[PDB]
Design a protein around this ligand. Structure first.
Ligand code: NA
Ligand code: NA
Ligand code: NA
Ligand code: NA
Lengths: 409, 204
């Protein structure tokens, strides 16, 4: 517990940019793109107000557009007078991917017609298209093969406080170890994380802070309308916050919370607000109506585990169940707990032979061990119960590929 | 029930079946079969023939049956086992886990075949586990797979009886003959014996 992430103060003018959405759409071969920027304001509405959205490639400005507020007509009562959408044509754009994290800089200026800048907000932009077609998850028209890992925000000394140093470090080891994607298990991460992924180049699964595993049954709350409000905010605010990061390629509804009507609602909400990205969720069986990807945890390659209500089929069999057509990406697989990862190659071989097996996210990145001190001030690695904490689940918080200090297993 | 159409030796295999001038002769072989056997309950699937590649003639005829006898599915393995002239993915000799990615007409692992992007048909091998001489090694692997995957709905082993023919020696005693034993040539020797039982019906 505590004030574990940054605290700050921000000054905005009275007439301000209260929101902005950045989208990139492409032509059949990506040789041409349209960057669309929706900008919203708070402040007195005035005729002389303008928005200028400019696109830069390094120190080169590649595109720009300016316009007064007042969106198009949308219904019988009109349109959003406090909004406006800029559309910028980009030819032969340099595309973003984890292999080549090309980025552009988008600068949104709020200013007077005549020139006076009120404020400017900005972001990095990755031109890329994420889309599921014919059962495959494509990136820029090509099928991804996910080399992922789940990663909590954990630090042996600091606990749940995340610093750039550590983040950078995690990123590099992952890249140096052939990983191309990471899952935010199981909550939106510290802001800087997304920026780093954008820049170094990693595919990200951004996940809502919603986990009700201890319930009985698991969907006790998620299936209850009375909890829909609290849940919705865990989803909506995430989306509103991270929708412009190119690194984020999929949204996730949370984790281990069974499957409830609430998930369905929320799933549709997202699809509605941001069609640019697929939505997945593993709860209730991993192939529910609330997920665009079959995303099981721990399904085996060849071996079926027919649990009731929520079987975990052999991943290869799962794909060809009658009527099934989705891609399969394990949200969790290969539990790296201790002396583990036996049978890892087996998964890879399957991922390589079957087109719709587009990989998965190993469970997980780093051991959740906390440093303690002995009678003579020497530090040692602690786990559940080592703090008088009980009930506890002992070493089960230690399942990483690397030790808490980042030394590899 | 399978129309009497096989043009295996053409180069490429669909040389005639893709020719509209052969449509007619081909049509009769399909139509007259349906016309004749359409009342037998035992017939559950129609087959367009065998090893004649994949040509337009097959699409037209596939359509003819569907039209005239919606009661039964039509299958055809030529041209790749999963062409638009077949309701059933019905490959010959596709392996359980092992891909054989021949160009133009690959034979994927059956388990893999079912879930290729956009694929939804059931799969029943029109030919499998080639029973020539001391064979059938790996038969169990298929059974396990068929049992495990709903869409893997079995197949037809190749084949039931050895095509040996009886000949006699000076002594007047009978012997089982094969390819070339009659002075025939060119011939394919023992290739005509792929059965589960010998010609006299004695099991292998
Ligand atoms: Na694959
Ligand atoms: Na754990
Ligand atoms: Na089956
Ligand atoms: Na033969």
């Amino acid at each position: 517990s505590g004030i574990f992430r940054d605290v700050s103060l921000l000054h905005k003018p009275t007439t301000q940019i209260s929101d902005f959405h950045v989208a990139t759409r492409f032509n059949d071969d990506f040789s041409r793109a349209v960057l669309e920027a929706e900008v919203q304001m708070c402040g007195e509405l005035r005729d002389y107000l303008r928005v200028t959205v400019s696109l830069w490639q390094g120190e080169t400005q590649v595109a720009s557009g300016t316009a007064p507020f007042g969106g198009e007509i949308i219904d019988e009562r009109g349109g959003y007078a406090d909004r406006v959408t800029l559309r910028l044509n980009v030819e032969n754009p340099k595309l973003w991917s984890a292999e080549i994290p090309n980025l552009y800089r988008a600068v949104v200026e709020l200013h007077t017609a005549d020139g006076t800048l009120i404020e400017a907000e900005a972001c990095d932009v990755g031109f890329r298209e994420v889309r599921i077609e014919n059962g495959l998850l494509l990136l820029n028209g090509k099928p991804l093969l996910i080399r992922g890992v789940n990663r909590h925000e954990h630090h042996p000394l600091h606990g749940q406080v995340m610093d750039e140093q550590t983040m950078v470090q995690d990123i590099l080891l992952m890249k140096q170890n052939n990983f191309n994607a990471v899952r935010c298990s199981h909550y939106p991460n510290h802001p800087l994380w997304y920026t780093l992924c954008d820049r170094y180049g990693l595919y990200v699964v951004d996940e809502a802070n919603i986990e009700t595993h201890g319930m009985v049954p698991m969907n006790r709350l998620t299936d209850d309308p009375r909890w829909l409000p609290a849940m919705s905010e865990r989803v909506t605010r995430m989306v509103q916050r991270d929708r412009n990061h190119p690194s984020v390629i999929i949204w996730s509804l949370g984790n281990e919370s069974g499957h409830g009507a609430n998930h369905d609602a929320l799933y549709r909400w997202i699809k509605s607000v941001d069609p640019s990205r697929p939505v997945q969720y593993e709860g209730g069986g991993a192939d529910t109506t609330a997920t665009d990807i079959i995303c099981p945890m721990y399904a085996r390659v060849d071996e079926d585990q027919p649990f009731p209500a929520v079987p975990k089929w052999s991943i290869k069999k799962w794909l060809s169940l009658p009527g099934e057509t989705r891609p399969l990406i394990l949200c969790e697989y290969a539990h790296a707990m201790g002396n583990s990862l036996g049978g890892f190659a087996k998964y890879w071989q399957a991922f390589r032979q079957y087109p719709r097996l587009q990989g998965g996210f190993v469970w997980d990145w780093v051991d959740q061990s906390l440093i303690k001190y002995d009678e003579n001030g020497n530090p040692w690695s602690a786990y559940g119960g080592d703090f008088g904490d009980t009930p506890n689940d002992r070493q089960f918080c230690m399942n990483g590929l690397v030790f808490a200090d980042r030394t590899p297993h």
